[PDB]
């Protein structure tokens, strides 16, 4: 439980950099833009998670459908085992049933 | 986001400060102190 004996260098965070000042600027593009682009067309990230939400099982299934043929051999096997275990756990295990 | 307890030093000090006058290993070891402190109260 020994704690550090020297004060760390305090992080001087600037609240007014380019990222924080312009954070969430075009969130209302659809409302104030004649409904030409839904706000879900601004999300940056995985191909299969742009404007989508789900639990762990529906996420792994969705990943296998879209980018499954582009994955590596080892990653393709690990995903299959994760799908099978979640399928068995969610349906054949639990308390409320 | 890996969350770890950092104030664990004060977690055990709140218990050992009531067990400073005990005899044996109860005044040093935390596992033996809590059972002694709880019975003390």
């Amino acid at each position: 439980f020994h704690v550090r004996v020297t004060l760390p260098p305090r992080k001087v965070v600037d609240r007014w950099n380019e990222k924080r000042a312009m954070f969430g600027v075009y969130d209302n593009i659809g409302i104030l833009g004649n409904f030409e682009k839904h706000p879900k067309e601004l999300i940056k990230g995985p191909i299969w998670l742009r404007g989508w939400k789900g639990n762990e099982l529906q996420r792994c299934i969705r990943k296998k459908r879209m980018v499954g043929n582009r994955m590596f051999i080892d990653d393709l096997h690990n995903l299959n085992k994760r799908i099978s275990y979640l399928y068995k756990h969610f349906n054949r295990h639990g308390k409320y049933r | 986001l890996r969350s770890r307890v950092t104030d664990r030093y004060w977690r055990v000090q709140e218990v050992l400060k009531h067990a400073r006058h005990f005899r044996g290993r109860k005044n040093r070891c935390y596992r033996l102190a809590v059972r002694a402190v709880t019975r003390a109260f």
Binding site: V3, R4, V5, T6, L7 | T6, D7
Partner: peptide, 26 residues
């Protein structure tokens, strides 16, 4: 190295207490 500052600073309150006990001020 655990992230944070409360743990680091709170111990500095303890280090001052030990120094006073070892070397009491006039």
């Amino acid at each position: 190295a655990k992230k944070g500052f409360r743990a680091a600073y709170r111990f500095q309150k303890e280090l001052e207490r030990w120094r006073l006990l070892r070397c009491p001020p006039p």
